[PDB]
Write a protein that binds this ligand. Structure first.
Ligand SMILES: CCC[C@@H]1CC(=O)N([C@@H](CC)C(N)=O)C1
Ligand SMILES: CCC[C@@H]1CC(=O)N([C@@H](CC)C(N)=O)C1
Lengths: 589, 567
């Protein structure tokens, strides 16, 4: 009856899955599948570029648009919730709208909103644009892995999906290289002037938007996954795509290129008035799929998969957010440690045309001597007085004056504002030709992370070959122990993250550990891909990735709620969870 | 007959080996084997901590222990000589005393004399105490490999003899981390009733001995390997041990012990004054051990023994590197980092000003105070050389990390300060008034190699990061088979371009250490697994310990010849 009807139904589902796998291994493995791998790797490169941007290059935005210190955590948190909701929504949509269609829509949204963020001024608009780029990038992996799976035979599935993390890593490397090239240096970016405004921040975002636009440009050529066509009652285009597959694979290598007759013979043998209605129907289909993800068939497998994904989330956070946060903190303490105090600049009426930086005066006194050529770069005076020391066309940078006076001294073209100069004595302290207005200070602490960007660049670049080694190596272990190796990797990652106290040592160790961590993530990704049915592969993958992102953003929330004094408690929680989940959460079919 | 008898013994060697490997294959695996692996790995943890101590920590700290100029460099060489003779002696002795007995006595020597070294004063006595500690610990790796391999089947040896490296590096990590935790800190050794204030590295040496104590306390449950019992010529105890381990391991899997226990009874049927007594025992055992070792150089094993000695020479420059080469560059990098971090302080004093600011790392030279007097001024890290201070009256001022040389004062009275004549070596005692002053016993050790304060941290991360590059390397060279050379070459080329890509800071040396120690020690494990399978158990431990002693000699002579050539 109904129960036996469903029994024969999923029996035929298994039969057709076997038949599709037979068709796939009949087509082969050649140029077409590697071209598709390169295109989906461009997509993963875009995803990695946005991950790097959000996790690494957030602290450079207070030089513009008046970014407050308390709202950086809010920006990161809301972008991670954007990635979460995007991953969940696009994963749910793909299995009832298309793997290529949803991937194209997500990449178009990401590219358009990244471009818009590159051309917005107010902080609110930039935050909104990054939030809506979050959904576009979060929708990538659940519709890249689960869409490249159906184009690969069983024997080559795990081996060739294990190499998709290399493109994520090279995307991180590309983003770091652009950051190092154009954010610090003023020779690569310049202000247009009257026609437009261009700081190194905008050019950085605009150039980081490029991998996404190339991915969407190259994604058009590849066709929709045949399995989706087969499941959605669409037969002719399935024949078309499979014919494209074997011909492209077999033109280079494969004797049957001469004639495909018998095999293709077997292949053919096998506006709210409607927009609102279709949106509601799509929502109903996605809700049905998500609810059936917790049915009697997958009541326990999905739960164990959740546990194994939670196992991984405490290394993804450490590599993506914890590492650059720690590097930034260490660079901050280093730049606080470095000092340059000038007691005075007394000279016998000799002009000083030389340029100096980091001038700080502590109780310095001037005997009413006029000095020409003084430079104010990274200058933070304290308890200092000036006597007729005015200079024409003086350049001001990082001017933070407090408890200091400038009696009978007038400066031109300075970044000083009313709020910058408070609680200090002043008489006739009026500055002419002042550049008052929107704060656009050059070298205004946005150039203070040059070493941070260089460290991130070389760390990721060196992770890349270690990642090559680890990815080439992990495929040797049997599939029953790749996730055990993942748990071991996470345990070692946490056992280090409980020990973070140095700069160069942390660079080297987190770099040589990025290889094993990233090579080990794809083992879990492959395990998630193979197990779930092709109808529910993308929902389940997106749902588990959404819980990985939820764990990451909850770690971010606690870390930003209590920072500095308490950092290692989440790592203790991580190690305890790893120990608890390595005992009985490895009985996965 | 003689010739017929020796021919029969040689031809029955294969039969007895087949019988014992069949017994091992039929006994089971999963509980006893893993508990044995854990206990013997915790015993190898002691060798790891000892080798780390002697390599990285021991040669530097000499000031508190009252060592001489040449002894400060000779200490490591002498400790390696002691570990040499210890490895040779215990490897030879383990083939006549037994498996567990020699391991127990070797770890007991390690524990007792490490404690005695932690509680000793005087350079010669400490030198001899660490010599005997090295003697005790040298024969800990050959005995552990032999005793552990006598409990595993022919195919199953690799997947445990490869993972003993896990505990070796766990020991390295523990020793390095614990050194980094204790060596800088001073309050871990708070004790009352004694005037002597020893440095905190005494507690470090004391806590390095705890792995040996834990191994001794855990080795009592594990019985001696039955293969030694069979080779000696006694059966009942061997059958006891075999049946007990089978009963212990029956819980893990399904083993039909009903008939398997029967054949272990008769497997041997086909496989055949008090101090004066102790002296006779000792001389007889020494002669028998010498003859047993001389049998290895006999033509029955000549070619393989010579090839093995050759590969032990070849596979030892990695040990030399990881022991002496990389610590030199690491400590030089740390020292130059500290030098760059500090700045020159020729003198910042100003007349008739409230110069109450605190200055760190006072390295003033020629900046004599011109009758400068200040009140409530704090001085830290005071180090003056031929500098005369006039009218410097400070009361209730605390100083630390102050060392003097060629120092002098003019009308300077110090109260509650750390200044003392202990650091006044080759310095004038002019105006050294110390009335109404707190005791100023200065610190030591850190004066020798001042840049080695957090070198233990970079060593700890090196030894820790060897692991993530260690499991992967072990699987790579354990599974692929005949493509190991190509895989290793590719990984080394990638690591070399990795190292060149590190052109930002002094992280390239840590990365090189980690990613080359991983491959080096994977290759070491390959060599060990190769050594254990070839030699028979009667001549296994003695041969492997002799090879280990030869490796120690290669390392010592290498450091000596590079000292002669370099510089
Ligand atoms: C986004 C949260 C972790 C992601 C999950 C996922 O699928 N990841 C891939 C990226 C190609 C990997 N590095 O294996 C890491
Ligand atoms: C660089 C030092 C190499 C050591 C020497 C040695 O004997 N090693 C074995 C035995 C546990 C290993 N870790 O496999 C590694």
């Amino acid at each position: 009856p109904g129960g036996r009807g469903e029994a024969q139904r999923r029996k035929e589902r298994e039969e057709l899955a076997q038949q599709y796998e037979a068709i796939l291994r009949e087509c082969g493995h050649g140029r077409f599948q590697w071209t598709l791998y390169f295109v989906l790797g461009l997509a993963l490169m875009a995803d990695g570029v946005e991950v790097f941007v959000v996790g690494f290059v957030l602290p450079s935005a207070e030089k513009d648009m008046c970014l407050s210190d308390s709202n950086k955590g809010m920006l990161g948190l809301i972008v991670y919730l954007g990635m979460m909701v995007g991953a969940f929504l696009w994963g749910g949509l793909a299995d009832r709208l298309g793997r290529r269609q949803c991937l194209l829509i997500s990449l178009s949204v990401n590219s358009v909103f990244a471009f818009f963020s590159s051309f917005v001024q107010g902080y609110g608009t930039f935050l909104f644009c990054r939030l809506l780029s979050g959904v576009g990038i979060g929708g990538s992996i659940p519709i890249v892995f689960s869409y490249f799976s159906e184009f690969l035979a069983q024997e080559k599935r795990g081996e060739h999906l294990s190499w998709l993390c290399m493109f994520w890593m090279i995307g991180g490397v590309y983003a770091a290289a652009m950051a190092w090239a154009i954010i610090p240096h003023y020779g690569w970016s310049f202000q247009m002037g009257s026609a437009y405004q261009f700081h190194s921040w905008r050019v950085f975002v605009l150039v980081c938007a490029f991998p996404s636009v190339f991915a969407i440009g190259a994604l058009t050529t590849q066709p929709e996954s045949p399995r989706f066509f087969l499941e959605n009652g669409k037969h002719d285009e399935a024949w078309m795509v499979l014919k494209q597959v074997h011909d492209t694979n077999m033109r280079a290598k494969g004797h049957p290129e001469r004639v495909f007759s018998v095999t293709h013979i077997k292949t053919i043998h096998q506006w709210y008035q409607r927009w609102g209605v279709r949106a509601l129907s799509l929502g109903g289909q996605v809700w049905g799929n998500f609810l059936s993800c917790f049915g009697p068939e997958y009541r326990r497998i999905t739960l164990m998969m959740m546990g194994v994904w939670f196992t991984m989330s405490f290394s993804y956070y450490g590599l993506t957010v914890w590492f650059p946060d720690m590097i930034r903190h260490l660079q901050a303490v280093d730049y606080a440690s470095r000092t340059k105090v000038f007691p005075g600049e007394r000279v016998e009426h000799v002009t000083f045309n030389f340029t100096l930086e980091n001038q700080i005066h502590r109780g310095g006194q001037y005997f009413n001597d006029k000095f020409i050529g003084l430079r104010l770069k990274s200058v933070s005076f304290e308890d200092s007085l000036f006597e007729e020391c005015y200079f024409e066309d003086v350049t001001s940078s990082n001017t933070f004056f407090r408890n200091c006076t400038f009696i009978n001294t007038v400066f031109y073209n300075t970044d000083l504002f009313e709020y910058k100069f408070v609680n200090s004595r002043l008489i006739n302290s009026t500055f002419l030709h002042n550049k008052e207005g929107c704060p656009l200070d050059v070298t205004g602490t946005g150039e203070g992370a040059y070493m941070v960007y260089f460290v991130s660049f070389l760390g990721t670049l060196a992770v890349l070959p270690g990642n090559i080694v680890s990815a080439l190596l992990m495929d040797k272990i049997g599939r029953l122990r790749m996730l055990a190796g993942s748990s071991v990797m996470s345990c070692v990652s946490c056992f280090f993250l409980s020990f973070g106290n140095s700069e160069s040592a942390m660079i080297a160790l987190l770099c040589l550990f990025g290889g094993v961590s990233i090579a080990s993530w794809n083992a879990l990704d492959v395990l998630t891909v193979e197990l779930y049915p092709s109808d529910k592969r993308t929902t389940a993958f997106g749902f588990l990735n959404a819980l990985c992102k939820l764990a990451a953003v909850l770690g971010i929330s606690i870390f930003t709620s209590f920072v500095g004094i308490t950092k290692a408690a989440p790592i203790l929680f991580a190690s305890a969870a790893l120990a608890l989940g390595s005992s009985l959460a490895l009985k996965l079919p």
